Design a protein around this ligand. Structure first.
Ligand SMILES: [Zn+2]
Lengths: 49, 86, 49, 144, 148, 144, 82
């Protein structure tokens, strides 16, 4: 039923990037893992939703 | 020996001259017909003609007038660098 | 004749709308029945004008 | 005589001129005149502009896409823009309905198709379904 | 012992010829990417306008094609490949049409690339392909089409 | 001649190299090149890295898990990363479609498979389904 | 045509260029010997081209091409007829 009604979508989990500055507790402006956002992401997974 | 040349436009407006009188317009009435004339480019009536102001409406009845000769006035500054050896 | 007068009118004008927000934007369906292959189609949006 | 109008008859010619890229001018009934064009570059598509006046240092034509229909082209009058004359200064234009008295002093309605003039500006009209000329005074405009 | 060559339907590329056929009144057939495959005709008689129909078949005595007015667009003709009805037909829906480039297996166990230049079918319906650089004809099962 | 490419044919060898732990380099079509690896330690699982450049004091490769499919390995080109040369400076790479005139001055399409060069940099090409060499000028790129 | 024009000279200065590299002088040491070079013609180290300055210190370095530099800025107006 879920596969029948859903739409194909890519799913990637989230995790805090190591680039977070230990003292201010806030991230670097530009690094490959996260492009300014304070959160990184894992490799995509395919799913229907 | 000219080394670098740059050209810059300060102003770009339209000035109207009367073919017969040879004067420039300075003022117009409610109907946009001429109220006054002046023989001075610096004091003449002007329509802005930078890129954003093209295709205006305020002076349609003026432009169509055959006695008037529109003129495109442009003011420029150019910078020329030189080298003259030792 | 009406140089110095107050004129009052009743008028009819054509109806006009603009889009302020989009509500229930995208609705989807993988239509497959009686098709050579699966197809994606966008169902009606709802607009708040 | 005056040659202010040079209407195109065949749409094939219109398309040929469009392939050449020359701008067109298409008339409308109780509506603004329009210009039409073929886009340059890789993708060829029809463009339109509501700007009629000539390109100038103070006036630049604005072009946009449109899904023009051949039905308008095949029906409405079409001209080369640069060759078009804005007006022909006569009392009754062509295709204008007038009432005239025939040769036997009987009155009939007609529409006008002629452009003739002397060198002073005196104009004459020849009516559809008629041969001889009719003056500005003889003809009478037929009210809608 | 085979049927004579069968021709592919040539898409008309230039607008001028398409209008010329349309002015003469010869029927066109347009494929729309989104909606459908349609016929286009300029109206008979003096009341001239463009007409569209979806009765995609030869005008049989028992199959009367029906027309309705539509404001066909120039851009529609340009972007969408168009055919003449007299050619586009079920008579040939060949998998690899003429001028198609394919990869074919050679006698030396090497896969070379060649273009189809002539097409004919045997009485059993199998399509024989003539390829550039080759003399004999080739079979559909032997071939491979490389896309992109 | 030049040996810039040493493609692996058998996946069994690829798995054997993976068991040895050497990094791989897998090509993609209209997409970024990727590196693949087997994880060390107790648990053995495939890892990937989007970092192509060599490990350095200013550049460290980033590895993450992935459920890689054998279908990509068996189909796509694979190389040992350290042995790979970034490019071979020729006009038409291998497996590039070109149009050439055959010996009887008849024109045919072909794809390229050869790497030969003198010591000056002059290159020659041998076409699939062909034997003799063809110059950079003789061949013509076939547009998509 | 030209309706009004005037030319004014903003600056007259001497600039230093290396004879070997051809790069102009960007920064110098305590005794005006070069420490940095730059390709820029205008950002180059410059000094007024006046006789008094010469007597007040070209003097210091050998890989040295002391070049003169002048700037012209021109104000002009046109009435382009139709
Ligand atoms: Zn980060």
């Amino acid at each position: 039923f879920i596969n029948d009604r859903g739409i194909k979508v890519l799913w990637e989990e989230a995790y805090f990037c190591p680039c977070l500055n230990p003292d201010t507790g806030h991230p670097r402006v530009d690094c490959p893992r996260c492009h300014g956002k304070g959160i990184a992401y894992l490799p995509p997974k395919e799913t229907i939703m | 020996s000219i080394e670098k040349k740059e050209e810059v436009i300060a102003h770009n407006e339209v000035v109207f001259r009367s073919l017969t009188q040879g004067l420039y317009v300075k003022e117009v009435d409610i109907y946009s017909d001429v109220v006054s004339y002046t023989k001075d480019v610096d004091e003449a009536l002007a329509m802005p003609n930078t890129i954003n102001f093209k295709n205006s409406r305020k002076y349609k009845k003026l432009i169509m007038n055959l006695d008037l000769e529109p003129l495109n006035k442009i003011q420029k500054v150019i910078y020329e660098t030189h080298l003259e050896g030792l | 004749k009406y140089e110095n007068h107050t004129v009052t009118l009743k008028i009819l004008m054509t109806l006009r709308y603009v889009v302020s927000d989009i509500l229930k934007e995208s609705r989807y369906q993988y239509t497959k029945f009686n098709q050579p292959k699966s197809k994606f189609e966008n169902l009606p949006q709802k607009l708040l004008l | 005589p005056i040659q202010d109008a040079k209407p195109i008859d065949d749409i094939v010619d219109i398309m040929t001129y469009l392939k050449n890229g020359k701008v067109l001018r298409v008339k409308q009934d109780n509506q603004g005149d329009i210009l039409v064009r073929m886009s340059p570059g890789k993708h060829k598509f029809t463009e339109v502009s509501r700007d009629l006046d000539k390109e100038s240092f103070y006036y630049k034509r604005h072009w946009v896409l449109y899904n023009v229909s051949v039905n308008s082209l095949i029906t409405f009058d079409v001209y080369l823009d640069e060759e078009y004359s804005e007006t022909t200064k006569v009392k009754y234009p062509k295709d204008t309905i007038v009432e005239y008295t025939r040769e036997d002093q009987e009155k009939d309605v007609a529409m006008i198709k002629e452009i003739l003039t002397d060198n002073n500006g005196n104009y004459f009209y020849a009516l559809i379904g008629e041969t001889m000329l009719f003056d500005e005074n003889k003809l009478n405009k037929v009210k809608d």
